[PDB]
UniProtKB/Swiss-Prot annotation, chain B:
Pfam families, A to Z: Ribosomal_L27A
Chief localization: cytoplasm
GO BP annotation list: translation
Protein name according to UniProt: Large ribosomal subunit protein uL15A
Quaternary context: Component of the large ribosomal subunit.
Biological source species: Entamoeba histolytica (strain ATCC 30459 / HM-1:IMSS / ABRM)
Source species, domain of life: Eukaryota
Claim: Iron is one of the keywords in the record: no
Gene Ontology MF: a single term: structural constituent of ribosome
Subcellular localization, as worded in the UniProt entry: Cytoplasm, Cytosol; Cytoplasm; Endoplasmic reticulum
The organism's taxonomic lineage, starting at the top: Eukaryota, Amoebozoa, Evosea, Archamoebae, Mastigamoebida
First and last residue of the signal peptide: none
RNA sequence: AAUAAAAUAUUACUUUGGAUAGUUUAGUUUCCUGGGCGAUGAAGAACGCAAUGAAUUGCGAUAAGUGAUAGGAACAAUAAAAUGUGAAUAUCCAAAAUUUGAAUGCUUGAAAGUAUACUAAGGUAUAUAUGAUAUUCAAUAUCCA
RNA sequence: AAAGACAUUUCUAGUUAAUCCUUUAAUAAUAAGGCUU
RNA sequence: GGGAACGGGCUUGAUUGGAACGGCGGGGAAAGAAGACCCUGUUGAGCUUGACUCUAAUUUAUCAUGUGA
RNA sequence: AAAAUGAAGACAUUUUAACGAGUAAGGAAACGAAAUGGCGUAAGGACAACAAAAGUAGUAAAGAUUUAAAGUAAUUUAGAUUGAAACUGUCCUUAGUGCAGAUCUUGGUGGUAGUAGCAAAUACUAAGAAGAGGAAAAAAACAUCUUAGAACUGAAGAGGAGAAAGGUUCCUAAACAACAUUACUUGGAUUAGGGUGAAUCGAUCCUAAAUUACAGAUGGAAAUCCUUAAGAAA
RNA sequence: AUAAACAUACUUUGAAUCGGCCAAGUCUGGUAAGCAGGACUGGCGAUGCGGGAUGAACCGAACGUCGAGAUAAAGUGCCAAA
RNA sequence: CGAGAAUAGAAACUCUUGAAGAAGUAAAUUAUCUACCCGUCUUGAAACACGGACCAAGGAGUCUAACAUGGAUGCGAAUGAGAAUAGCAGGAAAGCUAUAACAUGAAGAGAAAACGAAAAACUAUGAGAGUGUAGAAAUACAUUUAGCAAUAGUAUCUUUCAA
RNA sequence: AGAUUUGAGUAUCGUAAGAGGACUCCCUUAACUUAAGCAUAUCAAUAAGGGAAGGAAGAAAAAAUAACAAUGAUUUCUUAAGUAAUGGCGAAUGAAAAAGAAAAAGACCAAGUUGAUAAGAGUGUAACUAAUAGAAAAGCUAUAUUUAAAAGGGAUAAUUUAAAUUGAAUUCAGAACGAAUAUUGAGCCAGAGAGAGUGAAAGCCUCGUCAAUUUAGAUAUAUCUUGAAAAGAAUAUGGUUUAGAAAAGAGUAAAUUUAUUUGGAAGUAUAAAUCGAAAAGGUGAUAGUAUUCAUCAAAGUCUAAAUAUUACAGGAAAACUGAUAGCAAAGAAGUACUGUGAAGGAAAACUUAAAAGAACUUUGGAAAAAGAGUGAAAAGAGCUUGAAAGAGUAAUAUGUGAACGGAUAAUUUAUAAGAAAAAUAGUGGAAUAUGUUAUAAAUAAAGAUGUGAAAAGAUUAGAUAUAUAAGUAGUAUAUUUAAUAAGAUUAUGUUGAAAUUUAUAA
């Protein structure tokens, strides 16, 4: 070394020539994956959905104000949304019993995701033939359901002016099929954020933010003195 | 571009610009940072005087996410919402709506107080506040809000 | 352009496949064109050459007509009884000819040439009528957009546009300064040469008038 | 002082040599698709087989090739014979597949050999370890008359 | 004592307790590690 | 003569006809070999030894549960 | 260096003044008044007869040899001869990019030099035959075969046979380009054929020093140990 | 007093080099050395040219290619210009 | 006798040689002057120092990665986002598009706990812009204003045991 | 005698072995080297040795991170990051969570329960079995929810893979050549102007290439038939009559010590010696004890996909090499040749379009030579061109112990410079110049400020239909009805600079 330079720290003293990885296959991974995606789009047609994923908060205070897609809905979020956990995996919903319910806000946020998905979902009959039971039973209770829906319409008409179903019905009907590749791109994680405006009052004007920060800090560091004094 | 190297202008010169007395030999004092305390000590003293030794306590496993705290000065608060919004609420006061500058939404956690604020009331919402940051915000007619 | 990734546009691989081709493939490469009379009779452009055929040499020193006596697929050549050379000591040897320098003027048709000629003729008709289907559809699109014009215009002479509308763009002034010296000198020399050619032409025109 | 034999110098032609130029059925690298061997005897090795062959190629006592399916008139250095009643040529097919080699009845050095059983020759089977089933046993090991 | 949305901070005096920093979920007494000489 | 202090070449002189055969051992500080003597490398290797640091072999102690006194 | 002029002229402008040695070393490219100027090799992207046939080339490419011209020089240009199928000029981009040396690598070739040598093994001669091959003013020497003379190894041999090793060298015929330090009609050399016969000779069989298996013992492993002891084996 | 604007002040980045040797109206160790080691300056190294016959260092004088002249060191019997 | 100044005038030529070869240039020879073996180490080599018999072809500062300075370029409190990756047309190792993780930067000090920058700055010299006069051709002096860059020094502020 | 247990021989049906190992999972305590010496360290899961695998393998479903507004099997990429940390704290070595993506999938044994228990096992097969994490059996039931006769066949369609077929336009005219694709002239094709061959350069001569066709092979691709559309079956939260009153992986996790390893530092991982748990417990990386908190629940197994690849095989490309280069190998190259062996290991491309490869005579023993002949041309097989070193011939020139070079002349040779033209005076104006008119072209505009139109959407309020419906302006889709707010993009006024310079003809 001569003249002014940084102290060099290069880990090339080993055999790097056998540790060299080159990305000449990068342009062809794109073709291989895209083609496999298209064949995946068929076979399971329609709804090659990558499964509906929950809305979860990123870990740590560095990221906790952001939402991101988790893995699988908890059993309570499915029960709140009135979805059978056995049927959920077959209609493109990810399920994760490993995840514990973290907060009420998480439970409500991810139960609304399932409710929106179930309304946007169209399930085709297990048997295409028109004599399938579900299509047959749809006509059988079509007369009865009309009276059943009569009071529900007026249920939400007077009040809005525990008996809650354990499971909601699967939306099963015959329709012209339109394929959407991923349902997480249809149901947004969060709404777009606009400028927030608030009324300025004397109550907020006089608030001492720094004093509350110091008091919270000082109270945390004062628990050590209490224990020492108590043992004295 | 190998045609612009010095090797193309030293063709015909015997030693290629490395000298006849002191040849271009393999080593010039060792390999790497060798001899940092014996014969390259004048180099380490001159240019990196605190290279050798210890200072401070070890952190066996550092959680560098706990020290993450981006900061914004008071002079840079209004640029988060733009000058258009700033001029819209230029004549606001106590009683009517005042724009809220959510620093956490923009990735800033602590508000430091450096520089000057335009003389408009403003609601600054953040996680931590400097001492002068709160004074400068209050003196302008605004309020300080805590988050998280 | 070639869009088939399976075939190769490498000259070295093309010559290698030519030298190592099996006998079955060598027969097709050794093909010759039927003459005017035979083409009308069979509506076939060309067929692989065969022994006892009669050809006519159309390229080379001697344009003689003869009968095929050999089809040597190792050398990709043929022999003609009327094209020989006396090998010094008196005896004669046949002279090799490439099969693309001759045209077939008489066919030795046993039973498989008859089947081959029929197959080739039918395939020519199917492609000719397939092209007609495409041509009318391309013609139909043109007429639906230009009902006052017919598609025969594309085969006649073209009258170029003579309108010379200029556009005022604030970069013509800078154009001479946006060229490097090598291309500026060439451009200025071309301007000077072009101007001098007009000067001599004007002098010629003035003399012609008087 | 003198001669130009040898010596030296330049050019042309020729020679020794194989540079230079032009060329390429050969390489190098990257990428794509597979990654399909063997006791039903593999990879490797040896020997043998062409009308005239030494190598190489192909093949295995049916030998530079047999059948079948495609294929349609050649091969050639020379002479034969065959051939549209089907010549070349191609193959994930069928038949056949010498001695070895994990090499496996025993032996094996450059070794020639040799036993038994089944079906004189010829051909099969018989290594070691091991799973399942059957059968014949051994040990008072536990009961037990 | 003065400001504070249907809680809570600030200033003043008396008191009691803890007090150079760290061992990263919180404390404690040992232990160890930092800083200056 | 001077010069790297022992010239075939440089300076000044002596002197010179071109091509060579047989001998010869003065010279070409003649050829053979990156001196083997000497020194220097922060270059080795064989051998020696209470040089430094270790190690096989040997040795000593403890643990590893047979019964009845 | 300073003035002047400056869209393209051209020679990298015009004028004036000062200055110019050089080892080691430095001065990358681009920069109109240019923060040095250029030559050469190969490949890539463009440009190369401006009016619709647009660089050169079987009316002779590259290369080679010389003759002249331009340049301070690196080099370039053209002619002639040779050569017969590709190549060049300009701008950018790129580099496996410029050789007198490395006891450099590979190949080829000189002087030495028609020189040193073709001197151990006592030795050959005459006539004839075959053959292109002893001629000649002695060119004093002449390979193979037969005969005659003269000789050597001297029977612990330069004799007659085997083991190992070699591998067809064995025998015959044709033929002599190369090889045997001259030559060869000769040959262990070239070409083509032919040749090796076992009940009794050997191998095969037996064991010697020793060597190697199954099972067993040992080892992380490869593998090692054991050879009748450990085994319902032999 | 004299000189000094292609003056002056620099900033950054970097090369090579730190075996030196010579002279003398200088010095030290040594009998002395073409010996060893120093103070100041000029040189050679890195440098050719004219002269000292020859010479790394002496004397004159430092170099783009040339023409004509006055010169420097030093020379004017011949070699050799005078 | 005579400077200045005013008035008027008078200079455009010969010879020799050259396509029977001028001037110049090149080659070979002769003559005068002149010239030690190249590369390298070295204070110093033509050296009795080493390598080099001769010729052709090959032959040695390159590639990957980190940092820095510097010249050209884009954008600029932002820059990059050919990070992976996902799409587009065209078939494409090329090209185009993706409100985007993160990197570097916008804030610095402290071992760390804990913190976190205005007296809307001051002083000196300094770039530039006007007028007037005169020499008189350019230009030279006086006077009014402006105070950037740079340098040095000051108050004030952040962190530290310590600026 | 009989019933078992254990161990053998034989027969039958099978299984392992060897090759390959580029990529994959491991074992084993290299050194050169760096530290400017060297001994820890580094080189370095590196070389060599050894074992085992597949087209991928390994891993994989928390005794896991974290301390959050919390995540959630494994793998791979980006970032974190040359950071935390380790280190004669020297040289050097060196992660992981969070965050962003590719791909996604979860299932069983053991133990527990059920026992008129089920040819082979009762020393137990089999069935049920977890986040509301005290499960498990038999029978009735309530409410929500799921459901067509499964599996296997046959046919059509679609998407792909392979083979075969097909695939335009000058067999154009002239001149010239040994020979036409080059050349001149007139035409044509093109979803084909990638490429190869052809006496010589081809879009239109052959084969091909673009667009296609046909036939086979697959998909867990959809359609109809077999196939009826019923009986029933299933998921979850309960109630009830009997049954029952559980289990959850041991020489393991830890501990003392030793050795290696790790960034892991009073011990990150592995192993060995000793020791050794549980009315559970592990972790939160500073050792210790205590109390809380958080998060998991080890000591059995399987698992696609995203990922790697310089073996080998089949293809495609290339700012790569072009016969001393590129593989060692462009030919019978791992060949010839060397070595007892392990091993080592080359050189060598080109006639011509076509052999038309001279062919008969004279000389010679022959080889050959000279004629003759083939060919466009000897290009003559030692064959494209044919350099230098080294020789031979011819022409020219020079000469006493070197040779060569430079400046200056002389001699000789070569190169190499030209066809115009006088004085004066009569005619005769021809290029140009001066300046007058006319014509043409070019040269001035950067911006500033006004008025509209508008796709795609966005928000809100209504209407119809479908699906679903929690007592939260019900949601979602499709089609319609009005309103606001902006709007990429786009149309058009006003404003604001001329009078010069060249050329052309009188």
């Amino acid at each position: 070394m001569k003249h002014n330079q940084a102290v060099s720290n290069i880990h090339f003293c080993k055999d790097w020539r056998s540790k060299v990885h080159t990305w000449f296959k990068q342009p062809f991974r794109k073709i291989r994956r895209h083609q496999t995606r298209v064949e995946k789009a068929k076979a399971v047609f329609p709804a090659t959905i990558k499964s509906l994923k929950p809305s979860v908060h990123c870990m740590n205070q560095r990221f906790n104000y952001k939402l991101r897609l988790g893995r699988g809905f908890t059993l309570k979020e499915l029960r709140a949304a009135k979805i059978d956990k056995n049927l959920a995996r077959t209609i493109g919903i990810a399920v994760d019993p490993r995840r514990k319910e973290s907060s009420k806000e998480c439970l409500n946020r991810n139960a609304q995701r399932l409710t929106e998905y179930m309304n946007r979902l169209v399930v085709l009959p297990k048997v295409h033939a028109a004599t399938a039971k579900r299509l047959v039973l749809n006509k059988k209770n079509a007369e009865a359901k009309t009276k059943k829906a009569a009071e529900i319409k007026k249920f939400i008409a007077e009040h809005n002016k525990k008996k809650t179903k354990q499971f909601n019905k699967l939306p099963v009907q015959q329709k012209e099929a339109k394929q959407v590749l991923d349902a997480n791109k249809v149901i947004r994680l969060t709404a777009p954020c606009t400028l927030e405006t608030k009324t300025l009052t004397k109550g907020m004007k006089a608030f001492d933010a720094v004093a509350h920060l110091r008091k919270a800090k000082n109270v945390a560091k004062a628990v050590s003195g209490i224990v020492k004094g108590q043992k004295k | 571009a190998t045609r612009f190297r010095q090797t193309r202008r030293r063709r015909g010169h015997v030693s290629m610009g490395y000298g006849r007395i002191g040849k271009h030999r393999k080593q010039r004092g060792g390999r790497g940072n060798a001899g940092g305390q014996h014969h390259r000590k004048t180099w380490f003293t001159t240019f990196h005087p605190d290279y050798f030794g210890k200072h401070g306590m070890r952190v066996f496993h550092l959680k560098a996410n706990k020290y993450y705290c981006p900061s914004i000065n008071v002079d840079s608060l209004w640029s988060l919402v733009g000058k258009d919004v700033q001029a819209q609420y230029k004549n606001a006061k106590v009683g009517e709506e005042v724009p809220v500058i959510d620093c956490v939404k923009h990735g800033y956690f602590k508000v430091l107080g450096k520089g000057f604020l335009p003389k408009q009331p403003v609601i600054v919402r953040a996680r931590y506040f400097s001492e002068k940051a709160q004074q400068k915000i209050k003196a302008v007619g605004g309020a300080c809000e805590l988050t998280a | 352009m070639k869009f088939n990734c399976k075939v190769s546009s490498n000259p070295s691989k093309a010559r290698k496949a030519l030298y190592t081709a099996n006998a079955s493939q060598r027969a097709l490469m050794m093909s010759a064109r039927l003459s005017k009379e035979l083409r009308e009779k069979y509506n076939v452009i060309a067929i692989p050459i065969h022994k006892d055929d009669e050809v006519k040499i159309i390229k080379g020193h001697q344009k003689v007509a003869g009968k095929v006596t050999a089809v040597r697929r190792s050398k990709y050549v043929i022999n003609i009884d009327k094209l020989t050379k006396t090998k010094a000591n008196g005896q004669t040897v046949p002279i090799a000819i490439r099969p693309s320098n001759v045209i077939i003027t008489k066919l030795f048709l046993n039973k498989d040439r008859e089947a081959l000629l029929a197959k080739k003729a039918e395939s020519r008709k199917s492609y000719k009528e397939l092209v007609a289907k495409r041509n009318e559809e391309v013609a139909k699109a043109f007429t639906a957009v230009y009902p006052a014009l017919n598609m025969d215009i594309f085969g006649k002479k073209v009258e170029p546009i003579t309108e010379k509308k200029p556009i005022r763009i604030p970069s013509k002034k800078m154009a001479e300064k946006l060229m490097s010296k090598p291309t500026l000198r060439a451009y200025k020399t071309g301007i000077k040469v072009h101007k001098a050619k007009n000067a001599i032409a004007a002098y010629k025109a003035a003399l012609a008038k008087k």
